[PDB]
């Protein structure tokens, strides 16, 4: 029953009508956790776009679909994948966004060790985004390599905005258990109220992915890992002899159990490590089509 009320709300928020009117050649590319991703072709230019389709009846928390529209619409940034448009197609929300031919960082990190220049480039790009989101009290909530995407030319964009929440003077922390198990901050698993800091913890995990190829406790089943994260000390890298003090010291600022001592996005922006960041080109060798 509540379906209808929700579908109606959504209709008013999206752009009217159907995009099959201007796009051909819908083909699935992958899944997210919320719905499939297709590629498609603008009929009048032959230009490629991607399209995220999400069924309303298949959501664990339907409401979250409102961020897909609000985020891209209002938080347009150089390091944020550009949403062009959104639409309702029957029972599916369809978001039309730019096509990131470079793929995701997950593919790169499970197949290759990136050097600190390339890593620093990545974290720079993401923190530029998170500074700006957090500046407005917006927590992403699902930072992991999967959520980072690349262009052909090596540029880096954050995406997968479906899990985001907002805080403010009035509601300053959040409480929902949201995110992927291995990247979850310890306070969130512990069920305490939390703010943007959760994102920075997760970025610290993603640095571990970039360095060591997977997150801590990957082999465990999620719910065992969640416990260990919560109960244990911050995970450390596995081979420090190879890592520079700049980066080790950088990471010791992300992976801090107490959130109050953990570094903010703006603090991290001013961090010596990020000044090793290579140009977009320094990344392009990492992409599959190149290897």
């Amino acid at each position: 029953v509540s379906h209808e009320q929700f579908r109606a709300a959504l209709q008013l928020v999206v752009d009217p009508g159907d995009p099959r009117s201007y796009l051909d050649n819908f083909i699935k590319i992958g899944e997210g956790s919320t719905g499939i991703v297709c590629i498609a072709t603008v009929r009048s230019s032959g230009k490629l776009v991607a399209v995220k389709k999400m069924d309303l009846r298949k959501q664990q928390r339907r409401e979250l679909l409102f961020n897909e529209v609000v985020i891209m619409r209002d938080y347009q940034h150089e390091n944020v994948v550009e949403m062009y448009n959104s639409y309702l197609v029957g029972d599916e929300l369809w978001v039309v966004m730019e096509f990131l031919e470079g793929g995701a960082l997950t593919d790169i990190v499970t197949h290759t060790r990136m050097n600190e220049e390339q890593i620093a480039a990545v974290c720079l790009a993401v923190l530029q985004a998170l500074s700006v989101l957090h500046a407005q009290g917006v927590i992403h909530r699902d930072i992991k390599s999967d959520s980072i995407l690349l262009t052909h030319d090596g540029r880096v964009k954050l995406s997968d905005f479906g899990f985001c929440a907002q805080v403010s003077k009035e509601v300053p922390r959040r409480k929902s258990l949201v995110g992927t198990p291995y990247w979850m901050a310890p306070e969130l698993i512990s069920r305490l109220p939390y703010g943007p800091e959760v994102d920075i913890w997760s970025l610290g995990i993603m640095v571990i992915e970039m360095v060591d190829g997977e997150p801590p406790y990957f082999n465990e089943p999620p719910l065992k890992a969640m416990k260990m994260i919560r109960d244990n000390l911050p995970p450390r890298l596995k081979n420090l002899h190879k890592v520079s003090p700049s980066l080790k010291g950088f990471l010791d600022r992300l992976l801090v159990r107490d959130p109050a001592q953990r570094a903010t996005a703006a603090e991290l922006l001013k961090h010596p490590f990020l000044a090793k960041a290579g140009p977009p080109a320094s990344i392009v060798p990492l992409m599959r089509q190149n290897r």
Partner: protein
Amino acid sequence: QTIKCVVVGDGAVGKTCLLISYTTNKFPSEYVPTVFDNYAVTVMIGGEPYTLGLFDTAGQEDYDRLRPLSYPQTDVFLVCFSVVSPSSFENVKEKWVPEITHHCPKTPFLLVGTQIDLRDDPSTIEKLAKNKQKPITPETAEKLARDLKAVKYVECSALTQKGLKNVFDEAILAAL
């Protein structure tokens, strides 16, 4: 795998009602005190389906030695009180928490405030004012929970189904 929940709190607290509200999305029209009832639903978490074995017990005094025979291998407990019965809230500390502690020490437990729809109700707020008392606030409850020493405090209306699923959602998390 199975999850074994056990629900405890004073009579009337509407422990029976809470369970049925969630499981069947129906409210019991008649008040009946529970001796012992066992309802088993199935919950799917991350695509993994889990039989949730719920244990409705007696909130009465008569079954002090008959109730805890339901406790072997309990993965989690709900410790419940009506937010509009400061007596039942008092008996969290006094009777309930101690009881389950002993039988099952390493076992977790959430604090639960019930019938929260009756807070702003004038007639129940009248009934309490006639014994110079008032409704329990979250500020209060969440001090007790931290201190006592629960996983957390949760609250819900079996009637309106406000906050209901979440209680059961957090319990599962706690259990697993």
